[PDB]
Amino acid sequence: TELQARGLTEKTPDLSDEDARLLTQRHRVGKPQFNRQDHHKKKRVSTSWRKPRGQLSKQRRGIKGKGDTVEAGFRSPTAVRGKHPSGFEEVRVHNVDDLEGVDGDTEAVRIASKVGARKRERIEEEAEDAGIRVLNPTYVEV
Amino acid sequence: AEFDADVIVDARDCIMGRVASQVAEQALDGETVAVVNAERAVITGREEQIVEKYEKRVDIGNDNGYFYPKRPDGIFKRTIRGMLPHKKQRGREAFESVRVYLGNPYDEDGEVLDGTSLDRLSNIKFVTLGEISETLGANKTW
Amino acid sequence: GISYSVEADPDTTAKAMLRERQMSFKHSKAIAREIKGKTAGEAVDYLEAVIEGDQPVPFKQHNSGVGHKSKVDGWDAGRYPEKASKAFLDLLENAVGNADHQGFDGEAMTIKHVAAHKVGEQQGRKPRAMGRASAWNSPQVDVELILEEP
Amino acid sequence: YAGLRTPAESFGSGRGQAHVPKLDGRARRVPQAVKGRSAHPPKTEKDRS
RNA sequence: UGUCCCAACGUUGGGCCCGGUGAACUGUACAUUCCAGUGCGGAGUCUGGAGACACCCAGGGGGAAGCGAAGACCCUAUGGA
RNA sequence: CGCUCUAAUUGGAUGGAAGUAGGGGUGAAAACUCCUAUGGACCGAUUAGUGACGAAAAUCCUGGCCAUAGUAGCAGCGAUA
RNA sequence: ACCCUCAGAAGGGAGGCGAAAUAGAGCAUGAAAUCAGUUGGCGAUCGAGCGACAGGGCAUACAAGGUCCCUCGACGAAUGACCGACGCGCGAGCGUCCAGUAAGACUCACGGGAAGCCGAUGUUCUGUCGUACGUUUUGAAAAACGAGCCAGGGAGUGUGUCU
Ligand SMILES: [Cl-]
Ligand SMILES: [Cl-]
Ligand SMILES: [Cl-]
Ligand SMILES: [Cl-]
Ligand SMILES: [Cl-]
Ligand SMILES: [Cl-]
Ligand SMILES: [Cl-]
Ligand SMILES: [Mg+2]
Ligand SMILES: [Mg+2]
Ligand SMILES: [Mg+2]
Ligand SMILES: [Mg+2]
Ligand SMILES: [Mg+2]
Ligand SMILES: [Mg+2]
Ligand SMILES: [Mg+2]
Ligand SMILES: [Mg+2]
Ligand SMILES: [Mg+2]
Ligand SMILES: [Mg+2]
Ligand SMILES: [Mg+2]
Ligand SMILES: [Mg+2]
Ligand SMILES: [Mg+2]
Ligand code: NA
Ligand code: NA
Ligand code: NA
Ligand code: NA
Ligand code: NA
Ligand code: NA
Ligand code: NA
Ligand code: NA
Ligand code: NA
Ligand code: NA
Ligand code: NA
Ligand code: NA
Ligand code: NA
Ligand code: NA
Ligand code: NA
Ligand code: NA
Ligand SMILES: [Sr+2]
Ligand SMILES: [Sr+2]
Ligand SMILES: [Sr+2]
Ligand SMILES: [Sr+2]
Ligand SMILES: [Sr+2]
Ligand SMILES: [Sr+2]
Ligand SMILES: [Sr+2]
Ligand SMILES: [Sr+2]
Ligand SMILES: [Sr+2]
Ligand SMILES: [Sr+2]
Ligand SMILES: [Sr+2]
Ligand SMILES: [Sr+2]
Ligand SMILES: [Sr+2]
């Protein structure tokens, strides 16, 4: 009578104190948008980042207000870089055999969008029984 | 037409600029101020040079316009506006909760703000807003 | 061409469309805007008065150089686009007709939806001085109308 | 010779136009021109062994 | 002898309003400006003030160092005729 | 980092591929990925190659399109109809 | 096809076919520029590189993010008190002690709370900074040059020889 998601949807990973601290930091500190200079001034100029090269570029020259320039200093903490916001490290899965070797305590699985419903169903029931959470679950009316 | 002023200042024998500076400070702090007996406010210096300056402001102008007030009423209020960022929202709000009056339309007597009083027994070189207005051609309605 | 851009419950609604009409698109926006919300019969009476010259059509957007009209309410510029108006009378005639064929009281239904869309331009060229020619085109207009029971 | 079979010429300065070779009012030959030659295309003389 | 003093009235066609038809030039962006100043020394956009309720019609063209034409002058090129 | 096609190894797709639109997540970033709608047949990953491989600009090219504008013109000619 | 409408082989409406007519004729898909209608936010007393970063308003079906807020407590870097006591200074004020104490960013735990609620997204308001971009140039916001807008197109390639 209602929609419910298959699998261990509420499952949380178990992290060392330090990893939970750094994950919390990443989430608190965040980062600037880092969109290309003046992308907002011209429709033909997209948001995708490009190093400002103009000799007189205000952003290139680092004038406060012209947006931050990509630098290694903005990198996220090594120990948490790339983790899903839940804390899980993601594993791209295309079939059932891809579930093999996956630790449901540390990793959550993400079924490629291209995978069909039939194959997803098997992958989903096989992941739940393996204790692995599926980040993009199928919602069925139960 | 009725002005619930949290403060009523008496400008009589008080240095205009010093009162103005304090009425602005208070207006920005949210106080509703009414300056009274403006025609009796005072400005120090040589009357001839003082008047020459206000006469210049009156003569300045063009199509865009430089409407400068002649009544002690407006002279004083303009003086305050120059100490307020009247073009910003908070500034216009402050300025708009301040009013100046010829004589004293209230029943209470205004209070004399510290540091703004001028001792006539110790000063001969100073003028009166009313005197300035009369020279400017204002119709002495006070 | 266009498709109705709004949903319509067939049990309480009647539809109609004009296709590729060669008339001022700018006039059509003005007319649609003005008759939306009116009853079919009112719209018709209104448009006949426009063609007759007794009722101006407010020109709120395409108004450059347009002279003011005392009868325009809440606005200044207006005109009497009789051509596009007649095209709207056809549209209304079709709508109300369909309306009645379905059992409804056509004339009494409200113009729930009416909008004009520029579907294209019939192209033309005009010789000019100095050996050159410039564009001389005709707008092509589609317009949708949805009538709805009061 | 692809894109080179045209006597297209530029009008130079004067008509408020970019100095692009044109023929029958159409730009041609140059690489930035639609229907123009390929600037650095695959070449047959290249040793692919 | 209206060239002028010194301009007036009138005529015809436009101009203005309405139906229909229906282009082009031009457009980095923003843009209600004005006075001063500053700045690559000739600013609607920077700074300080002043002024500024929105929109529309008609107008004569002060400004946009207006639009149109990669200055016809001058110089430079181990250029052309 | 991304693009094309080739090869080896290895996967996805009518139980819905690519693309597109809107939206969620990751990466300093190039960019990667998922969801929903559309779509209705193809699409990847790794590794070694291949190269007509990346655009905001050139009075750049071609196509499409907006403001200009319901604006100018549809009067002027000794043939005013 | 049939029917209705219409001056009408037009068009429109209803209807029939097909998995699909949003496959109905330059008829697979259907971007941007852009147009009509409309939803959210702003809006007829107010100022212009259009934003970046902070923080408030209002707005939000699901999915793909799940956090966030307040009492208190634990930890507690640099920094770092009030008050009180004593003692100096013409005075504003200062010294000694209290004391490197109370406090102190982040993070965590207990208890309570929020689901438009936290993130995010749209718009708008406030604060700080801010006169595009690329090029020419000693010096560009430039009254120096280029572009109306968008999409697509658009520039280190081959042979030979040398190093
Ligand atoms: Cl790195
Ligand atoms: Cl004036
Ligand atoms: Cl201000
Ligand atoms: Cl004295
Ligand atoms: Cl149009
Ligand atoms: Cl921490
Ligand atoms: Cl190179
Ligand atoms: Mg853009
Ligand atoms: Mg006019
Ligand atoms: Mg000719
Ligand atoms: Mg070619
Ligand atoms: Mg030249
Ligand atoms: Mg010469
Ligand atoms: Mg010679
Ligand atoms: Mg392999
Ligand atoms: Mg391209
Ligand atoms: Mg470039
Ligand atoms: Mg005009
Ligand atoms: Mg005659
Ligand atoms: Mg098609
Ligand atoms: Na003085
Ligand atoms: Na004046
Ligand atoms: Na308008
Ligand atoms: Na009116
Ligand atoms: Na009126
Ligand atoms: Na040819
Ligand atoms: Na060869
Ligand atoms: Na005469
Ligand atoms: Na002018
Ligand atoms: Na010669
Ligand atoms: Na051009
Ligand atoms: Na907000
Ligand atoms: Na240049
Ligand atoms: Na520049
Ligand atoms: Na300049
Ligand atoms: Na144009
Ligand atoms: Sr899919
Ligand atoms: Sr003070
Ligand atoms: Sr308009
Ligand atoms: Sr020349
Ligand atoms: Sr200013
Ligand atoms: Sr004129
Ligand atoms: Sr290329
Ligand atoms: Sr046009
Ligand atoms: Sr005639
Ligand atoms: Sr003529
Ligand atoms: Sr049908
Ligand atoms: Sr401590
Ligand atoms: Sr392009």
Tab-separated table of all heavy atoms in Angstrom, chain F residues 23-24 35 38 57-59 61 64, chain G residues 30 63-64 120 133 146-147 149 152:
chain	number	residue	atom	x	y	z
F	23	G	P	17.607	21.919	-12.086
F	23	G	OP1	17.327	23.157	-11.319
F	23	G	OP2	18.802	21.844	-12.973
F	23	G	O5'	17.748	20.698	-11.068
F	23	G	C5'	16.823	20.536	-9.986
F	23	G	C4'	16.885	19.130	-9.435
F	23	G	O4'	16.763	18.174	-10.526
F	23	G	C3'	18.156	18.657	-8.745
F	23	G	O3'	18.312	19.165	-7.424
F	23	G	C2'	17.892	17.160	-8.722
F	23	G	O2'	16.839	16.833	-7.837
F	23	G	C1'	17.370	16.948	-10.141
F	23	G	N9	18.494	16.662	-11.027
F	23	G	C8	19.040	17.474	-11.993
F	23	G	N7	20.094	16.954	-12.560
F	23	G	C5	20.245	15.720	-11.939
F	23	G	C6	21.229	14.706	-12.118
F	23	G	O6	22.199	14.695	-12.880
F	23	G	N1	21.002	13.623	-11.282
F	23	G	C2	19.973	13.519	-10.382
F	23	G	N2	19.945	12.401	-9.646
F	23	G	N3	19.050	14.445	-10.209
F	23	G	C4	19.250	15.515	-11.011
F	24	G	P	19.789	19.322	-6.795
F	24	G	OP1	19.621	20.229	-5.638
F	24	G	OP2	20.760	19.669	-7.854
F	24	G	O5'	20.180	17.864	-6.259
F	24	G	C5'	19.439	17.238	-5.182
F	24	G	C4'	19.964	15.837	-4.896
F	24	G	O4'	19.773	14.980	-6.059
F	24	G	C3'	21.447	15.678	-4.599
F	24	G	O3'	21.822	16.036	-3.275
F	24	G	C2'	21.642	14.189	-4.840
F	24	G	O2'	21.128	13.397	-3.796
F	24	G	C1'	20.787	13.980	-6.088
F	24	G	N9	21.617	14.158	-7.277
F	24	G	C8	21.588	15.192	-8.185
F	24	G	N7	22.513	15.093	-9.101
F	24	G	C5	23.184	13.920	-8.790
F	24	G	C6	24.306	13.305	-9.410
F	24	G	O6	24.959	13.691	-10.384
F	24	G	N1	24.666	12.128	-8.764
F	24	G	C2	24.041	11.613	-7.653
F	24	G	N2	24.546	10.476	-7.163
F	24	G	N3	23.003	12.176	-7.066
F	24	G	C4	22.632	13.321	-7.681
F	35	C	P	20.155	4.987	-11.250
F	35	C	OP1	19.460	3.726	-10.887
F	35	C	OP2	20.434	5.276	-12.673
F	35	C	O5'	19.294	6.190	-10.665
F	35	C	C5'	18.779	6.145	-9.331
F	35	C	C4'	17.807	7.273	-9.113
F	35	C	O4'	18.499	8.546	-9.193
F	35	C	C3'	16.720	7.381	-10.163
F	35	C	O3'	15.662	6.479	-9.916
F	35	C	C2'	16.297	8.838	-10.043
F	35	C	O2'	15.446	9.069	-8.941
F	35	C	C1'	17.645	9.514	-9.790
F	35	C	N1	18.288	10.039	-11.015
F	35	C	C2	17.857	11.268	-11.526
F	35	C	O2	16.918	11.859	-10.965
F	35	C	N3	18.469	11.783	-12.615
F	35	C	C4	19.467	11.122	-13.196
F	35	C	N4	20.057	11.689	-14.254
F	35	C	C5	19.910	9.854	-12.717
F	35	C	C6	19.296	9.354	-11.637
F	38	U	P	8.125	9.116	-19.460
F	38	U	OP1	6.709	8.832	-19.836
F	38	U	OP2	9.016	8.009	-19.034
F	38	U	O5'	8.853	9.822	-20.691
F	38	U	C5'	8.335	11.027	-21.279
F	38	U	C4'	9.321	11.576	-22.283
F	38	U	O4'	10.560	11.924	-21.609
F	38	U	C3'	9.747	10.613	-23.382
F	38	U	O3'	8.802	10.601	-24.453
F	38	U	C2'	11.088	11.195	-23.809
F	38	U	O2'	10.943	12.330	-24.639
F	38	U	C1'	11.660	11.644	-22.461
F	38	U	N1	12.507	10.616	-21.828
F	38	U	C2	13.811	10.503	-22.274
F	38	U	O2	14.277	11.215	-23.141
F	38	U	N3	14.552	9.525	-21.669
F	38	U	C4	14.136	8.656	-20.685
F	38	U	O4	14.924	7.816	-20.248
F	38	U	C5	12.779	8.836	-20.266
F	38	U	C6	12.029	9.786	-20.835
F	57	A	P	34.753	31.446	-29.798
F	57	A	OP1	33.343	31.128	-30.097
F	57	A	OP2	35.791	30.406	-29.977
F	57	A	O5'	35.253	32.711	-30.631
F	57	A	C5'	34.539	33.957	-30.547
F	57	A	C4'	35.459	35.121	-30.186
F	57	A	O4'	35.980	35.007	-28.838
F	57	A	C3'	36.667	35.450	-31.065
F	57	A	O3'	36.621	36.851	-31.262
F	57	A	C2'	37.854	35.181	-30.141
F	57	A	O2'	38.963	36.013	-30.426
F	57	A	C1'	37.261	35.599	-28.802
F	57	A	N9	37.942	35.125	-27.598
F	57	A	C8	38.977	34.231	-27.463
F	57	A	N7	39.272	33.953	-26.221
F	57	A	C5	38.386	34.732	-25.485
F	57	A	C6	38.162	34.868	-24.103
F	57	A	N6	38.812	34.179	-23.176
F	57	A	N1	37.216	35.741	-23.706
F	57	A	C2	36.529	36.411	-24.636
F	57	A	N3	36.630	36.356	-25.957
F	57	A	C4	37.588	35.482	-26.322
F	58	A	P	35.847	37.449	-32.528
F	58	A	OP1	35.487	38.832	-32.154
F	58	A	OP2	34.774	36.498	-32.931
F	58	A	O5'	36.976	37.503	-33.646
F	58	A	C5'	38.175	38.252	-33.409
F	58	A	C4'	39.316	37.696	-34.224
F	58	A	O4'	39.473	36.284	-33.949
F	58	A	C3'	39.124	37.719	-35.728
F	58	A	O3'	39.450	39.037	-36.157
F	58	A	C2'	40.148	36.679	-36.204
F	58	A	O2'	41.462	37.180	-36.360
F	58	A	C1'	40.183	35.697	-35.025
F	58	A	N9	39.664	34.352	-35.259
F	58	A	C8	38.586	33.759	-34.648
F	58	A	N7	38.383	32.522	-35.017
F	58	A	C5	39.390	32.286	-35.939
F	58	A	C6	39.717	31.159	-36.690
F	58	A	N6	39.045	30.019	-36.611
F	58	A	N1	40.769	31.242	-37.532
F	58	A	C2	41.441	32.395	-37.604
F	58	A	N3	41.228	33.536	-36.939
F	58	A	C4	40.175	33.409	-36.110
F	59	U	P	38.889	39.608	-37.555
F	59	U	OP1	39.080	38.593	-38.616
F	59	U	OP2	39.551	40.944	-37.685
F	59	U	O5'	37.321	39.792	-37.334
F	59	U	C5'	36.802	40.613	-36.260
F	59	U	C4'	35.783	41.610	-36.790
F	59	U	O4'	36.438	42.701	-37.475
F	59	U	C3'	34.811	41.081	-37.827
F	59	U	O3'	33.759	40.426	-37.146
F	59	U	C2'	34.310	42.359	-38.511
F	59	U	O2'	33.182	42.937	-37.878
F	59	U	C1'	35.513	43.303	-38.363
F	59	U	N1	36.219	43.679	-39.600
F	59	U	C2	35.627	44.624	-40.425
F	59	U	O2	34.542	45.123	-40.195
F	59	U	N3	36.359	44.963	-41.530
F	59	U	C4	37.596	44.484	-41.886
F	59	U	O4	38.139	44.919	-42.903
F	59	U	C5	38.135	43.501	-41.002
F	59	U	C6	37.448	43.135	-39.923
F	61	C	P	33.038	35.762	-40.799
F	61	C	OP1	32.906	36.585	-42.028
F	61	C	OP2	32.112	35.979	-39.665
F	61	C	O5'	32.924	34.228	-41.180
F	61	C	C5'	33.612	33.688	-42.307
F	61	C	C4'	33.206	32.250	-42.489
F	61	C	O4'	33.637	31.508	-41.321
F	61	C	C3'	31.701	32.006	-42.556
F	61	C	O3'	31.243	32.138	-43.892
F	61	C	C2'	31.604	30.564	-42.094
F	61	C	O2'	32.053	29.685	-43.105
F	61	C	C1'	32.662	30.537	-40.994
F	61	C	N1	32.163	30.814	-39.639
F	61	C	C2	31.428	29.826	-38.987
F	61	C	O2	31.104	28.807	-39.616
F	61	C	N3	31.075	30.009	-37.697
F	61	C	C4	31.409	31.135	-37.066
F	61	C	N4	31.102	31.237	-35.763
F	61	C	C5	32.089	32.195	-37.732
F	61	C	C6	32.443	31.996	-39.007
F	64	G	P	18.831	29.748	-41.977
F	64	G	OP1	17.664	29.347	-42.819
F	64	G	OP2	19.505	31.044	-42.222
F	64	G	O5'	18.399	29.742	-40.447
F	64	G	C5'	17.670	28.645	-39.880
F	64	G	C4'	17.643	28.761	-38.371
F	64	G	O4'	19.005	28.787	-37.849
F	64	G	C3'	17.037	30.032	-37.798
F	64	G	O3'	15.615	30.015	-37.799
F	64	G	C2'	17.616	30.028	-36.392
F	64	G	O2'	16.998	29.045	-35.583
F	64	G	C1'	19.054	29.595	-36.678
F	64	G	N9	19.925	30.742	-36.935
F	64	G	C8	20.350	31.209	-38.159
F	64	G	N7	21.114	32.267	-38.069
F	64	G	C5	21.201	32.518	-36.706
F	64	G	C6	21.895	33.545	-35.992
F	64	G	O6	22.584	34.474	-36.439
F	64	G	N1	21.719	33.416	-34.618
F	64	G	C2	20.972	32.439	-34.006
F	64	G	N2	20.931	32.483	-32.677
F	64	G	N3	20.318	31.490	-34.651
F	64	G	C4	20.475	31.585	-35.990
G	30	G	P	12.725	13.412	-27.632
G	30	G	OP1	12.871	13.243	-26.166
G	30	G	OP2	11.381	13.305	-28.244
G	30	G	O5'	13.318	14.830	-28.039
G	30	G	C5'	14.698	15.143	-27.810
G	30	G	C4'	15.090	16.362	-28.606
G	30	G	O4'	15.009	16.055	-30.032
G	30	G	C3'	14.199	17.592	-28.393
G	30	G	O3'	15.024	18.756	-28.400
G	30	G	C2'	13.340	17.578	-29.651
G	30	G	O2'	12.802	18.826	-30.029
G	30	G	C1'	14.376	17.129	-30.670
G	30	G	N9	13.842	16.737	-31.969
G	30	G	C8	12.617	16.169	-32.239
G	30	G	N7	12.347	16.122	-33.513
G	30	G	C5	13.475	16.657	-34.124
G	30	G	C6	13.744	16.925	-35.496
G	30	G	O6	13.005	16.768	-36.470
G	30	G	N1	15.022	17.450	-35.675
G	30	G	C2	15.921	17.696	-34.670
G	30	G	N2	17.117	18.170	-35.052
G	30	G	N3	15.669	17.488	-33.385
G	30	G	C4	14.433	16.978	-33.187
G	63	A	P	12.406	10.177	-1.077
G	63	A	OP1	12.629	9.236	0.052
G	63	A	OP2	12.878	11.575	-0.965
G	63	A	O5'	13.051	9.547	-2.393
G	63	A	C5'	12.827	8.176	-2.769
G	63	A	C4'	13.495	7.896	-4.098
G	63	A	O4'	12.885	8.726	-5.121
G	63	A	C3'	14.975	8.241	-4.138
G	63	A	O3'	15.754	7.129	-3.715
G	63	A	C2'	15.214	8.589	-5.603
G	63	A	O2'	15.408	7.456	-6.419
G	63	A	C1'	13.883	9.239	-5.986
G	63	A	N9	13.828	10.701	-5.914
G	63	A	C8	13.571	11.468	-4.803
G	63	A	N7	13.503	12.751	-5.051
G	63	A	C5	13.748	12.841	-6.413
G	63	A	C6	13.809	13.936	-7.286
G	63	A	N6	13.591	15.195	-6.903
G	63	A	N1	14.098	13.692	-8.584
G	63	A	C2	14.301	12.427	-8.966
G	63	A	N3	14.258	11.313	-8.240
G	63	A	C4	13.974	11.592	-6.955
G	64	A	P	16.814	7.306	-2.526
G	64	A	OP1	17.079	5.951	-1.979
G	64	A	OP2	16.327	8.382	-1.630
G	64	A	O5'	18.131	7.819	-3.248
G	64	A	C5'	18.839	6.974	-4.164
G	64	A	C4'	19.553	7.809	-5.197
G	64	A	O4'	18.571	8.595	-5.925
G	64	A	C3'	20.519	8.855	-4.666
G	64	A	O3'	21.778	8.297	-4.324
G	64	A	C2'	20.596	9.825	-5.837
G	64	A	O2'	21.405	9.365	-6.902
G	64	A	C1'	19.136	9.847	-6.283
G	64	A	N9	18.388	10.902	-5.600
G	64	A	C8	18.072	11.001	-4.263
G	64	A	N7	17.432	12.101	-3.954
G	64	A	C5	17.308	12.767	-5.164
G	64	A	C6	16.737	14.001	-5.511
G	64	A	N6	16.163	14.828	-4.642
G	64	A	N1	16.777	14.364	-6.808
G	64	A	C2	17.356	13.541	-7.690
G	64	A	N3	17.931	12.366	-7.488
G	64	A	C4	17.877	12.032	-6.188
G	120	A	P	24.459	23.877	1.264
G	120	A	OP1	25.873	24.104	0.880
G	120	A	OP2	23.639	25.003	1.769
G	120	A	O5'	23.657	23.257	0.035
G	120	A	C5'	24.183	22.167	-0.735
G	120	A	C4'	23.145	21.695	-1.726
G	120	A	O4'	21.993	21.169	-1.010
G	120	A	C3'	22.541	22.771	-2.615
G	120	A	O3'	23.386	23.078	-3.710
G	120	A	C2'	21.237	22.120	-3.045
G	120	A	O2'	21.458	21.123	-4.029
G	120	A	C1'	20.804	21.451	-1.736
G	120	A	N9	19.957	22.305	-0.900
G	120	A	C8	20.360	23.109	0.141
G	120	A	N7	19.375	23.755	0.720
G	120	A	C5	18.251	23.355	0.013
G	120	A	C6	16.898	23.694	0.134
G	120	A	N6	16.430	24.555	1.045
G	120	A	N1	16.026	23.121	-0.727
G	120	A	C2	16.498	22.277	-1.645
G	120	A	N3	17.753	21.888	-1.864
G	120	A	C4	18.591	22.467	-0.990
G	133	C	P	38.179	40.907	-16.210
G	133	C	OP1	38.548	39.938	-15.147
G	133	C	OP2	39.112	42.016	-16.525
G	133	C	O5'	37.888	40.063	-17.533
G	133	C	C5'	37.240	38.781	-17.456
G	133	C	C4'	37.050	38.189	-18.831
G	133	C	O4'	36.112	38.987	-19.599
G	133	C	C3'	38.282	38.107	-19.711
G	133	C	O3'	39.062	36.967	-19.387
G	133	C	C2'	37.659	38.002	-21.098
G	133	C	O2'	37.083	36.738	-21.341
G	133	C	C1'	36.485	38.964	-20.966
G	133	C	N1	36.790	40.338	-21.402
G	133	C	C2	36.613	40.669	-22.760
G	133	C	O2	36.291	39.783	-23.555
G	133	C	N3	36.806	41.944	-23.160
G	133	C	C4	37.181	42.873	-22.270
G	133	C	N4	37.323	44.129	-22.699
G	133	C	C5	37.416	42.554	-20.895
G	133	C	C6	37.212	41.289	-20.509
G	146	G	P	37.200	47.471	-33.471
G	146	G	OP1	36.794	47.560	-34.906
G	146	G	OP2	36.495	48.306	-32.471
G	146	G	O5'	37.109	45.958	-32.986
G	146	G	C5'	37.694	44.901	-33.762
G	146	G	C4'	37.223	43.562	-33.253
G	146	G	O4'	37.916	43.215	-32.029
G	146	G	C3'	35.750	43.470	-32.900
G	146	G	O3'	34.969	43.229	-34.057
G	146	G	C2'	35.738	42.282	-31.953
G	146	G	O2'	35.872	41.079	-32.677
G	146	G	C1'	37.037	42.507	-31.171
G	146	G	N9	36.881	43.289	-29.945
G	146	G	C8	36.802	44.659	-29.851
G	146	G	N7	36.709	45.084	-28.624
G	146	G	C5	36.709	43.929	-27.857
G	146	G	C6	36.625	43.759	-26.442
G	146	G	O6	36.513	44.630	-25.560
G	146	G	N1	36.670	42.415	-26.089
G	146	G	C2	36.768	41.368	-26.973
G	146	G	N2	36.781	40.146	-26.437
G	146	G	N3	36.842	41.512	-28.287
G	146	G	C4	36.809	42.809	-28.658
G	147	A	P	33.453	43.749	-34.124
G	147	A	OP1	33.113	43.877	-35.554
G	147	A	OP2	33.287	44.910	-33.220
G	147	A	O5'	32.583	42.587	-33.487
G	147	A	C5'	32.699	41.222	-33.916
G	147	A	C4'	32.102	40.332	-32.862
G	147	A	O4'	32.894	40.483	-31.657
G	147	A	C3'	30.689	40.728	-32.446
G	147	A	O3'	29.717	40.098	-33.274
G	147	A	C2'	30.619	40.234	-31.011
G	147	A	O2'	30.381	38.842	-30.952
G	147	A	C1'	32.045	40.515	-30.524
G	147	A	N9	32.235	41.816	-29.888
G	147	A	C8	32.031	43.055	-30.441
G	147	A	N7	32.369	44.045	-29.655
G	147	A	C5	32.808	43.417	-28.499
G	147	A	C6	33.331	43.915	-27.291
G	147	A	N6	33.510	45.214	-27.038
G	147	A	N1	33.676	43.019	-26.342
G	147	A	C2	33.507	41.721	-26.597
G	147	A	N3	33.037	41.131	-27.695
G	147	A	C4	32.706	42.046	-28.620
G	149	C	P	27.328	38.713	-28.900
G	149	C	OP1	28.111	38.817	-27.644
G	149	C	OP2	27.990	38.217	-30.141
G	149	C	O5'	26.023	37.831	-28.659
G	149	C	C5'	25.178	38.028	-27.513
G	149	C	C4'	24.009	37.066	-27.562
G	149	C	O4'	23.148	37.396	-28.684
G	149	C	C3'	24.394	35.613	-27.806
G	149	C	O3'	24.787	34.973	-26.604
G	149	C	C2'	23.127	35.033	-28.412
G	149	C	O2'	22.116	34.761	-27.465
G	149	C	C1'	22.664	36.202	-29.280
G	149	C	N1	23.161	36.134	-30.670
G	149	C	C2	22.466	35.349	-31.593
G	149	C	O2	21.500	34.688	-31.203
G	149	C	N3	22.866	35.337	-32.884
G	149	C	C4	23.925	36.064	-33.260
G	149	C	N4	24.272	36.055	-34.545
G	149	C	C5	24.674	36.839	-32.332
G	149	C	C6	24.265	36.843	-31.060
G	152	G	P	27.616	22.991	-29.730
G	152	G	OP1	27.698	21.765	-28.909
G	152	G	OP2	28.402	24.181	-29.348
G	152	G	O5'	28.074	22.665	-31.218
G	152	G	C5'	27.566	21.530	-31.920
G	152	G	C4'	27.719	21.734	-33.403
G	152	G	O4'	26.973	22.920	-33.806
G	152	G	C3'	29.125	22.010	-33.910
G	152	G	O3'	29.912	20.823	-34.038
G	152	G	C2'	28.826	22.662	-35.254
G	152	G	O2'	28.396	21.735	-36.237
G	152	G	C1'	27.642	23.559	-34.883
G	152	G	N9	28.123	24.868	-34.441
G	152	G	C8	28.194	25.351	-33.152
G	152	G	N7	28.766	26.519	-33.076
G	152	G	C5	29.068	26.844	-34.389
G	152	G	C6	29.722	27.980	-34.932
G	152	G	O6	30.189	28.960	-34.344
G	152	G	N1	29.829	27.893	-36.317
G	152	G	C2	29.376	26.848	-37.082
G	152	G	N2	29.576	26.953	-38.401
G	152	G	N3	28.772	25.782	-36.590
G	152	G	C4	28.655	25.844	-35.247
